[PDB]
Amino acid sequence: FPMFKRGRCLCIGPGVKAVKVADIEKASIMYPSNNCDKIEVIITLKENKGQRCLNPKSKQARLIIKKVERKNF
């Protein structure tokens, strides 16, 4: 079927929810996904590694900021 996501910088959540908040679930970007005029984060919130571009409607990266800001490797 022709659904076609019109937004090329659209995301629904290719990840999980609440993980090792220092290993995964760490959004460190604010960029148009390099195709856009909008600016989103890349959370690697996963069991090991995976994307989480949360921006459409709810970002929540605002809170995850204090998560990504926890220590540094």
- Report the alpha-carbon distance of residue 66 to residue 21 in Å, rounded: 9
CATH assignment of the domain containing 41? 2.40.50.40
Contact 12, 54 (CB under 8 A): no
Contact 42, 53 (CB under 8 A): yes
Closest Cα partner for 52 from 70, 21, 26, 34? Answer: 26
Give me the domain span that covers residue 60.
Answer: 1-73
Method: NMR
**How many domains does the chain fold into?**
1
